[PDB]
PDB file of C-alpha atoms in Angstrom:
ATOM      1  CA  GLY A   1      -0.076  -0.053  -0.048  1.00 41.79           C
ATOM      2  CA  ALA A   2       0.948   3.689   0.183  1.00 39.80           C
ATOM      3  CA  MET A   3       1.871   5.166   3.227  1.00 39.42           C
ATOM      4  CA  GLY A   4      -0.539   8.584   3.938  1.00 37.12           C
ATOM      5  CA  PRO A   5      -3.362  10.113   1.382  1.00 38.63           C
ATOM      6  CA  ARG A   6      -1.107  12.286  -0.496  1.00 36.09           C
ATOM      7  CA  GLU A   7       1.842  10.283  -2.315  1.00 35.44           C
ATOM      8  CA  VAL A   8       4.606  12.156  -4.831  1.00 35.46           C
ATOM      9  CA  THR A   9       6.135  10.299  -6.471  1.00 36.12           C
ATOM     10  CA  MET A  10       8.954  11.640 -10.114  1.00 37.53           C
ATOM     11  CA  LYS A  11       9.156  10.815 -13.186  1.00 37.40           C
ATOM     12  CA  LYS A  12      12.287  10.333 -15.211  1.00 39.08           C
ATOM     13  CA  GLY A  13      11.359  13.030 -17.136  1.00 40.81           C
ATOM     14  CA  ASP A  14       8.632  14.587 -15.199  1.00 41.83           C
ATOM     15  CA  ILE A  15       8.532  18.346 -14.075  1.00 42.75           C
ATOM     16  CA  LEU A  16       7.770  19.121 -10.133  1.00 42.83           C
ATOM     17  CA  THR A  17       7.039  22.570  -8.574  1.00 43.27           C
ATOM     18  CA  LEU A  18      10.133  23.324  -6.353  1.00 43.50           C
ATOM     19  CA  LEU A  19       8.508  23.187  -3.799  1.00 42.00           C
ATOM     20  CA  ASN A  20      11.262  24.025   0.098  1.00 44.55           C
ATOM     21  CA  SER A  21      14.483  22.909  -1.337  1.00 43.34           C
ATOM     22  CA  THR A  22      15.865  23.579   2.649  1.00 44.34           C
ATOM     23  CA  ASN A  23      16.574  20.830   2.768  1.00 45.16           C
ATOM     24  CA  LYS A  24      20.632  19.534   1.405  1.00 44.47           C
ATOM     25  CA  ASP A  25      20.264  15.832   1.675  1.00 48.87           C
ATOM     26  CA  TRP A  26      16.606  16.265  -0.159  1.00 50.88           C
ATOM     27  CA  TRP A  27      14.232  19.135  -1.929  1.00 49.74           C
ATOM     28  CA  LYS A  28      10.817  19.375  -1.755  1.00 49.82           C
ATOM     29  CA  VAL A  29       8.427  18.848  -5.071  1.00 48.61           C
ATOM     30  CA  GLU A  30       5.375  18.558  -5.720  1.00 50.25           C
ATOM     31  CA  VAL A  31       3.508  16.670  -8.336  1.00 51.16           C
ATOM     32  CA  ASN A  32      -0.171  17.899  -8.572  1.00 53.56           C
ATOM     33  CA  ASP A  33      -1.728  17.769  -5.684  1.00 48.23           C
ATOM     34  CA  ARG A  34       0.729  15.847  -4.182  1.00 50.80           C
ATOM     35  CA  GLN A  35       3.662  16.767  -2.644  1.00 52.53           C
ATOM     36  CA  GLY A  36       6.237  15.623  -0.394  1.00 53.00           C
ATOM     37  CA  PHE A  37      10.401  15.005   0.893  1.00 52.40           C
ATOM     38  CA  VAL A  38      12.043  13.856  -2.375  1.00 53.29           C
ATOM     39  CA  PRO A  39      16.568  12.988  -2.739  1.00 55.55           C
ATOM     40  CA  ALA A  40      18.142  15.904  -4.802  1.00 56.59           C
ATOM     41  CA  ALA A  41      19.744  13.306  -6.387  1.00 57.78           C
ATOM     42  CA  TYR A  42      16.746  12.099  -8.557  1.00 59.45           C
ATOM     43  CA  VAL A  43      15.940  16.105  -9.069  1.00 58.91           C
ATOM     44  CA  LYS A  44      17.836  19.578 -10.682  1.00 58.89           C
ATOM     45  CA  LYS A  45      17.047  22.885 -11.266  1.00 58.80           C
ATOM     46  CA  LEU A  46      16.134  23.330 -14.930  1.00 59.60           C
ATOM     47  CA  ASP A  47      16.695  26.486 -16.631  1.00 61.65           C
ATOM     48  CA  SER A  48      14.228  28.792 -17.982  1.00 59.91           C
ATOM     49  CA  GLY A  49      14.380  32.683 -17.875  1.00 64.93           C
ATOM     50  CA  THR A  50      11.164  34.054 -16.851  1.00 66.92           C
ATOM     51  CA  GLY A  51      12.422  33.042 -13.765  1.00 64.13           C
ATOM     52  CA  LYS A  52      10.109  30.184 -12.061  1.00 67.12           C
ATOM     53  CA  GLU A  53      10.952  27.258  -9.075  1.00 65.66           C
ATOM     54  CA  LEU A  54      10.738  23.985 -11.627  1.00 67.45           C
ATOM     55  CA  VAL A  55      12.859  21.263 -10.747  1.00 68.49           C
ATOM     56  CA  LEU A  56      13.417  18.668 -13.779  1.00 66.50           C
ATOM     57  CA  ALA A  57      12.842  14.315 -12.364  1.00 63.86           C
ATOM     58  CA  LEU A  58      16.154  12.868 -12.836  1.00 64.04           C
ATOM     59  CA  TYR A  59      15.504   9.789 -11.600  1.00 65.38           C
ATOM     60  CA  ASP A  60      12.069   8.037 -10.973  1.00 63.00           C
ATOM     61  CA  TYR A  61      10.804   8.408  -6.636  1.00 62.60           C
ATOM     62  CA  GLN A  62       7.976   7.749  -4.436  1.00 63.22           C
ATOM     63  CA  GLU A  63       6.682   9.245  -1.653  1.00 64.24           C
ATOM     64  CA  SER A  64       4.072   8.164   0.984  1.00 61.64           C
ATOM     65  CA  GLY A  65       2.433  10.925   3.268  1.00 61.56           C
ATOM     66  CA  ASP A  66       4.035  14.105   3.539  1.00 61.23           C
ATOM     67  CA  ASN A  67       6.904  12.856   5.240  1.00 59.78           C
ATOM     68  CA  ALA A  68      10.260  14.754   7.009  1.00 57.71           C
ATOM     69  CA  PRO A  69      13.184  13.361   5.282  1.00 58.83           C
ATOM     70  CA  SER A  70      15.088  11.544   8.721  1.00 60.54           C
ATOM     71  CA  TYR A  71      17.479   9.942   6.626  1.00 60.03           C
ATOM     72  CA  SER A  72      19.569  10.585   4.044  1.00 59.22           C
ATOM     73  CA  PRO A  73      18.654   9.949   0.430  1.00 60.04           C
ATOM     74  CA  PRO A  74      17.507   6.279  -1.680  1.00 62.46           C
ATOM     75  CA  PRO A  75      20.844   5.342  -4.292  1.00 62.80           C
ATOM     76  CA  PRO A  76      20.050   6.036  -7.293  1.00 66.06           C
ATOM     77  CA  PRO A  77      20.297   4.443 -11.314  1.00 67.62           C
TER      78      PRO A  77
END
């Protein structure tokens, strides 16, 4: 199953609002209607020009219920 009603999953090649990136080992990102803490290693700030806050998903991730990064980020592919 999936913890929490709102689960954020980053898809390789998907854009996710650069949510509170305060964390260094984890960059918060939203997904349409589901947000959560994710490993910055799976994402990376892009370049547009306007000045928005977006981050492409380099790798695939899965978050079950907005949870704080109390542990280290998972190993990428």
